[PDB]
């Protein structure tokens, strides 16, 4: 049985980083060399294994996490990194074994007035643990007085929205990301 990668990569809607998506991959066979040759995949870098030897291996269980960041934040989706995305949205462990894949999606995910559907968490009192998903919408208490569900002075919405216009630089453009985590399910 061939593996449902088309369901992941070619999906119609993509999640925002703070609420990233996570699909299981099990009991399947997959050809990774076809993927590795895609012109779309600006980033296709593995940790532990090498993309070349992916077809000759197999893994106990595989996860495909997927989300949308902006081009110059793709470098945070890697072990040992820091930044808003790596700290507060999606965190890889230092011992990560898997692959990070990213392609530019300027035509699907940008919009001339701005595409405000994609969000990321700006504020959090402490960093995310590896593979943690925080989806809290609670007003962020930046001062000693509580916020009582109303944003204001020292009381911020924890989620900000990307602008995503197609005319900005490549670092500002939306990139779709898929993270394959490898632990016999998928060979």
């Amino acid at each position, epitope marked *: 049985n061939l593996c449902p990668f088309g369901e992941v990569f070619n999906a119609t809607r993509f999640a925002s980083v703070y609420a990233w998506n996570r699909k299981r991959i099990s009991n399947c066979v997959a050809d990774y060399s076809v993927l590795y040759n895609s012109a779309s995949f600006s980033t296709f870098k593995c940790y532990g294994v090498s993309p070349t030897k992916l077809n000759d291996l197999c893994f106990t269980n595989v996860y495909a996490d997927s989300f949308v960041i902006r081009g*110059d934040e793709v470098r945070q989706i890697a072990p040992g990194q*820091t*930044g*808003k995305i790596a*700290d*507060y949205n999606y965190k890889l462990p230092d011992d990560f074994t898997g692959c990070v894949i990213a392609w530019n999606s300027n035509n699907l995910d940008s919009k001339v007035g701005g595409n405000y559907n994609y969000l990321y968490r*700006l*504020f*959090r*009192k*402490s*960093n995310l643990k590896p593979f943690e998903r925080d989806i809290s919408t609670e007003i*962020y*208490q*930046a*001062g*000693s007085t509580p916020c009582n569900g109303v944003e204001g*002075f*020292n009381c911020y919405f924890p989620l*900000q929205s990307y*602008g995503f*216009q197609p*005319t*900005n*630089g490549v*670092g*500002y453009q939306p990139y779709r990301v898929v993270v394959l985590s490898f632990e016999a399910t998928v060979c």
Partner: antibody
Amino acid sequence: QVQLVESGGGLIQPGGSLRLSCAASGFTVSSNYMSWVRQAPGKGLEWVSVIYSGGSTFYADSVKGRFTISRDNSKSTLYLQMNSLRVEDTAVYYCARDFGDFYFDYWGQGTLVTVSS
Amino acid sequence: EIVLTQSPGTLSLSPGERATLSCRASQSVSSYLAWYQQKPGQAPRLLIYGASSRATGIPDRFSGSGSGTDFTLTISRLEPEDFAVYYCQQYGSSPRTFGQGTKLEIKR
């Protein structure tokens, strides 16, 4: 209101060290982004250092390797440790509350740091 | 390294008139632009963020306009305290960088 009072500036020799601190009132130091922004005599503004709410720290390249930003929530204090100082570094240093590593909505009063031989 | 070029360097006007300060970026910073006022011997004060959004407690006559690489700060009826130095700052790309300033000078 929000208040930010710097201190620790003074005179100092090239190669010397110097610790700035910023007493902060009106918000939770550990819950916010905070930056140091300096201004040389008669010149514009230069961003020096930032610390995130989660504790990640970032540095301007001219100061990186020599400056270290830190904080102490119990004391409501931000700090900038400046080592291996140069004449270049002579400036008023402003402590500033940082809205999400974007812009500086609240500034301190500044502390003057002059580096002379 | 986004470079912000503020013009003019000095702007000479009378109380009552309107002032148009421009900031040009070396690359598009979308709307991630802010403006600061610095009176002599004082610290900078945030005037405007997100190119157009007025900061809390900033009066009516300060307005921000523009996008991408072209921005303008406009002061509609100058009170005498409005004669200070103004700075632009981008936060669309790192490291964040400031303009070099425009000085608003009493004309005679």
